[PDB]
Ligand binder design. Structure first.
Ligand SMILES: OC1(c2ccc(Cl)c(C(F)(F)F)c2)CCN(CCCC(c2ccc(F)cc2)c2ccc(F)cc2)CC1
Ligand SMILES: OC1(c2ccc(Cl)c(C(F)(F)F)c2)CCN(CCCC(c2ccc(F)cc2)c2ccc(F)cc2)CC1
Ligand SMILES: CCCCCCCCCCC(=O)O
Ligand SMILES: CCCCCCCCCCC(=O)O
Ligand SMILES: CCCCCCCC(=O)O
Ligand SMILES: CCCCCCCC(=O)O
Ligand SMILES: CCCCCC(=O)O
Ligand SMILES: CCCCCC(=O)O
Ligand SMILES: [Ca+2]
Ligand SMILES: [Ca+2]
Ligand SMILES: [Cl-]
Ligand SMILES: [Cl-]
Ligand SMILES: [Cl-]
Ligand SMILES: [Cl-]
Ligand SMILES: [Zn+2]
Ligand SMILES: [Zn+2]
Lengths: 382, 382
């Protein structure tokens, strides 16, 4: 039936709210009003889906969630993890987009920003399990999620990342992951946990869901005991240079996966060799783009508004090859780095910068069809 | 005390809310965060004030309000006017910025956008009165506002307009003044008339103030009988080409007043000769700028986002002279048209386009100091 034999799953980044989980008025993550990625690709007979995972969660939490989004079932963050960081072991339960998913039946994964990292970690679990959970179920018995076992191979065909901060971002180091702003993010999570809320910002495993019979004051009190406030098991940390490195150190190349990356630049070189945001950089990334572009290390300055170019091209100590826009991106085992997209900012990739006339919908539709083509190629070269 | 012998009054345009009449979070009309016009000019020892008049009212209503803003007293729209259009004769009562205002004590008037038109009409009344009101107080006796008398001369030194649609705007013709959107504007006015509201959008004379003991349902009912819904005595109409023409036809040059205009361009010529908004044009003017720039008459296309250049330069049927930036603008009796400011949009003039880094505060401060200088010149060349 569908033109693509393996389904394509699009994995949003940090703060990503998609589908039924967005506010009443809110931009549409995958494509904005420029190109309705899911709807349009479907009209053209491609099987495509958009995952919904934790907007504020760590990559670990998101990676677990992603698995359950595809496979269906009750999120199991694993007993050891839960115990280490101090959050619920079990989480939401998902219908499952592909309940038969197992070695043999494959999926294409494309991830925007932090979605890139999430995809990589999930494949890690599939192939090589989770050591701490294997170890814990060794010592203490019990049931273990298959996700954490290892040996599940031949389940992901491609990993493709749009503006992913593979090597982290100064924006996280010097802003996002600071004390003051973590407290804000957590407060937002606390609030949207109120008994009148219909959105899930993704930190409920930490106890940010008010019980229907509990006062807001008791809620505040209950939840201020949560480890979330001082924990590292959260998105803000995973986006730092340290945080991202950790994930790099614990991942490896799957030689049957077709790995490909895209990158944007949206800064320009200023008086002293520092980088400043172009007019056209979506305005909410103004300050981050300046923090990044004023980095002491010079090669860390060119940025797309929140991710510097070094960070996006490839995870820094993994194999990569520079690639052409015309040549087929068909090499397994190595990070095929597509040429930098001049004047695309972080959010241009998902078409939500309605302020930027220079980034037209027909352009964005080419880009996504581009990606589907590459994917079709991967399918045809097995 | 003050470096300027005659006070400078800045008159905001359509939708203009200033001072104590703005919402909790709301941009500051005169200068935004770029250059606090009123506060800064004062720090440098200039006597300057910001008028507060009807945001949605006709030029007539605003002109009357302006007079009372300066002079102090209870707004009197005049009995014949009130009767003709079908709205309260009396309105808010103003403390008075300048209680002694009379021939001999003069004021400098600078108006942004529709503020330009309002200033023109008020001076007309001062000099040549209102015929309808003269006539009606003839037939039916009573008291008459001094504004409508005529013969009050030598009271305004200068009229200076920033991006005023002297000849109206297609944006009004094809959008602002349509049936559907007038109804929206009026609903907003109706709502902000509620008994919990602290802002005055300027249409209360039409009955849009809920009485403290009246239900919202009775309010809706009472007010749906108001002439406002189908009247022309409103801003949206006065901003149309017809509407603006009417004011042109009934105004004339006072040869002791120093008339000066500024204009912005913020569109660029496309493939087929039509004009499109530059990146940098404040985003709320996107659609208007396209409507204007796609006009059949070609000379009506270059625009600042909502006002086409033909409209801003000078009222089309009145005397004007092109001027240089250095040429001191000191000619009485004729519209001294300053050279177009390239890449200034409608709102750049008042510094509220926080999205536009290209428009710096130091630039805006020069422009305003510019204006004060010209005014000082007018003072010194009497
Ligand atoms: O700040 C971002 C970030 C990314 C990575 C890192 Cl590492 C960091 C860090 F480190 F600094 F914290 C920060 C995340 C979100 N930012 C703006 C969000 C846009 C928003 C939007 C976009 C897509 C949607 F589906 C829904 C809403 C929106 C709002 C209003 C609107 F009119 C249009 C769009 C861009 C970058
Ligand atoms: O729409 C406008 C118009 C003008 C003339 C005509 Cl003729 C027509 C018509 F009729 F054709 F439709 C329409 C009026 C106001 N528009 C945008 C409002 C700006 C707003 C602002 C401005 C001044 C303030 F003191 C405070 C806020 C604001 C909002 C948010 C923000 F982040 C910054 C500024 C621009 C043009
Ligand atoms: C009859 C009064 C209800 C008007 C409709 C809603 C207005 C909002 C009231 C604001 C507030 O209570 O702070
Ligand atoms: C408050 C000034 C009038 C602007 C109306 C047009 C804007 C609607 C387009 C949607 C958007 O703002 O993204
Ligand atoms: C991110 C802001 C959410 C918008 C709230 C407006 C709701 C409404 O008026 O229906
Ligand atoms: C098109 C109507 C505009 C008001 C609501 C949209 C706000 C948003 O961009 O989320
Ligand atoms: C940009 C429109 C301003 C209208 C003022 C208000 O809604 O209170
Ligand atoms: C928070 C983003 C700016 C305002 C968006 C809009 O009015 O469409
Ligand atoms: Ca952009
Ligand atoms: Ca601008
Ligand atoms: Cl939210
Ligand atoms: Cl499995
Ligand atoms: Cl919830
Ligand atoms: Cl009121
Ligand atoms: Zn966790
Ligand atoms: Zn009136």
């Amino acid at each position: 039936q569908p033109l693509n034999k393996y389904p394509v799953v699009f994995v949003h980044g940090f703060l990503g709210l998609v589908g039924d989980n967005a506010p009443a008025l809110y931009p549409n993550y995958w494509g904005g009003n420029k190109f309705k990625v899911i709807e349009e690709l479907r009209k053209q007979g491609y099987n495509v889906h958009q995952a919904s995972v934790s907007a504020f969660g760590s990559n670990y939490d998101r990676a677990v969630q992603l698995y359950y989004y595809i496979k269906g079932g009750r999120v199991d963050y694993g007993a050891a993890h839960a115990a280490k960081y101090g959050h619920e072991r079990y989480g939401k339960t998902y219908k499952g987009i592909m309940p038969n998913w197992e070695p043999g039946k494959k999926v294409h994964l494309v991830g925007h920003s932090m979605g890139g990292q999430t995809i990589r970690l999930m494949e890690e679990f599939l192939r090589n399990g989770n050591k701490e959970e294997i170890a814990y179920h060794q010592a203490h018995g019990g049931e273990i999620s298959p996700l954490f076992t290892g040996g599940h191979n031949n389940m992901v065909a491609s990993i493709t990342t749009l503006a992913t901060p593979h090597n982290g971002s100064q924006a996280a180091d010097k802003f996002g992951n600071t004390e003051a702003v973590r407290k804000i993010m957590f407060a937002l999570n606390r609030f949207m946990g109120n008994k009148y809320s219909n959105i899930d910002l993704g930190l409920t495993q930490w106890g940010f869901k008010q019980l229907p019979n509990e006062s807001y004051i008791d809620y505040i009190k209950r939840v201020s005991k949560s480890k979330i406030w001082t924990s590292d098991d959260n998105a803000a940390y995973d986006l730092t240079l340290d945080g991202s490195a950790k994930l790099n150190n614990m991942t490896s190349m799957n030689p049957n996966i077709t790995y490909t990356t895209y990158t944007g630049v949206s800064s320009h070189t200023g008086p002293l060799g520092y980088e400043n945001p172009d007019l056209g950089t979506f305005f909410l990334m103004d300050t981050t783009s300046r923090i990044i572009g004023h980095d002491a290390r010079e090669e860390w300055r060119k940025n797309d508004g929140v991710v510097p170019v070094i960070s996006s091209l490839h995870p820094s100590n993994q194999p990569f090859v520079n690639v052409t826009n015309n040549e087929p991106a068909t090499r397994r085992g190595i990070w095929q780095v597509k040429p930098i997209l001049q004047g695309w900012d972080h959010v241009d990739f998902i078409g939500v910068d309605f302020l930027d006339f220079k980034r037209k919908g027909s352009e964005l539709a080419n880009f996504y069809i581009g990606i589907i083509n590459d994917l079709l190629s991967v399918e045809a070269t097995e």
